[PDB]
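Intended use. Records such as the protein (pectate lyase) entry shown here are meant for training and evaluating sequence-to-structure methods. They are not intended to support clinical decisions.
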Amino acid sequence: ADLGHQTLGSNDGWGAYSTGTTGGSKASSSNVYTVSNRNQLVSALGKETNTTPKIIYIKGTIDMNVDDNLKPLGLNDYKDPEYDLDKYLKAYDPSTWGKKEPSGTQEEARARSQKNQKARVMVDIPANTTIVGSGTNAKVVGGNFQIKSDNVIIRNIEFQDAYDYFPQWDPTDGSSGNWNSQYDNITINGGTHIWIDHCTFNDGSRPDSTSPKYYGRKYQHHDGQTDASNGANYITMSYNYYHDHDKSSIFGSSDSKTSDDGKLKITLHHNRYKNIVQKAPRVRFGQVHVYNNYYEGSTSSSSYPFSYAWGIGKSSKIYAQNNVIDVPGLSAAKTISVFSGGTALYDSGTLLNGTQINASAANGLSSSVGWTPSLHGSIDASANVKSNVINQAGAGKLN
Ligand SMILES: [Ca+2]
């Protein structure tokens, strides 16, 4: 079968469980579309009721920040009449406003401005859908694909810069406050049976060191790359290339969402992470199989300095095998970050700068996660991961 008709292998990760992930492979010829702009894309997807098997080919670059006549939309097109960044900055300055959540005129105007952008950039993908990039240059710029449905395949697309024009100031986030934005490249919100393969994720032509700092904190226009929340389950992410971005992948959005326990069954394999700061992934609750991935970065980078790879969150059950990390000077314990409620991690074959390490033992965690992965393809030796991943991961390697 061709790229549009290929399905997830019967043993290829948690996405292969139960009914498996076949996307729109059973589509008739009338439900095979070739799209090259936002209008064609939204028309082919249809609404939530469009559950008929469908195959969508993305040809060329699709900019999501455009109006219905395909005219590019910027800051001034989305801005609410009352919103003014200079007035926003003056109103919520920590020295005069304090550490309380922004409220009043400028925050209400900013929120309305954000909703104007949300309407163009966020699109929902209906059940039984395959979205694949045509050739080696298929790109989605500015969009946020949201998957709340079952049985979806997304492959061979470069997703760039899911950019929020109106970041919100949150003085209570962390120790010194932080600027927060709303859009990811892909948001899995309760979606099941999903395969994300051979895609590339980056911040395009607007990386984070092109943003100024306000209140001593970077004015952050980005959020996640591939995030999963609210009971998302049975997902395989393979051969993806994540690079030049801060917060990559958050699986499980909150410590109080106890209904995520038993869900968030995700398999990550053969992915490349280059110049990724943190959360790759950060996990709460889920049984996540992480194998044959390659992480490379530098703690002294001037754009995206490495902080940590795996985030061991509340009740997480990460099972990691033969992963390779190349970050000069990093100690074994600092490859991961442990959060309250995180007490277990299984890791075998971890290579840090050419030497075998045990991340779990270095952090005093238990190795008993209560499960062993049953669905997986062949496992590469740690010695061959770097070459395999650099040569095969990312969009444009297939077509
Ligand atoms: Ca997110």
